[PDB]
Structures are given as structure tokens and as C-alpha cells.
């Protein structure tokens, strides 16, 4: 249900962001009252992912 797909590349600047990758999908494993939330990328890797950006979940 959850897949905000990522968009423009962005690094992890705040502990474990997930370096958005602009075409793999993410999966929102939590969220938040914040844009980034609870995800795991394509990469099989868990961080906090954007969704002012990105697309799909936010």
C-alpha cells in the first residue's frame, strides 16, 4: 500500500535517511507528522525517507 517512490537523489542528513536513488520505489514501514518517515528502499535498506519529494506515499 505504502510505496512513495523516491525522485530527486537525497542524502541522509538527519541518522539513517535513506540516499533516495530517484526511481526505486520506497515502502513506508512507519510515518511520521514530519516528510520523512519510516521506509526501507529498493535497496533493502531501512531509513527515514522524504516525501516532499519523492512520490507515491507521503
Known amino acids: 500500500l505504502k510505496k512513495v517512490v523516491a ?3 537525497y542524502m541522509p ?6 540516499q533516495l536513488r530517484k526511481g526505486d520505489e520506497y515502502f513506508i ?5 514530519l516528510p ?4 526501507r528502499d529498493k535497496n533493502g535498506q ?7 519529494y ?3 506515499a507521503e
Open 46 to 52: 531501512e531509513g527515514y525517507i522524504p516525501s516532499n
Open 29 to 33: 514501514l512507519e510515518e511520521s507528522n
Open 7 to 9: 525522485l530527486y537523489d
Open 54 to 56: 519523492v512520490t507515491e
Open 36 to 39: 520523512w518517515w519510516r521506509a
Open 13 to 18: 542528513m538527519n541518522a539513517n535517511d535513506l
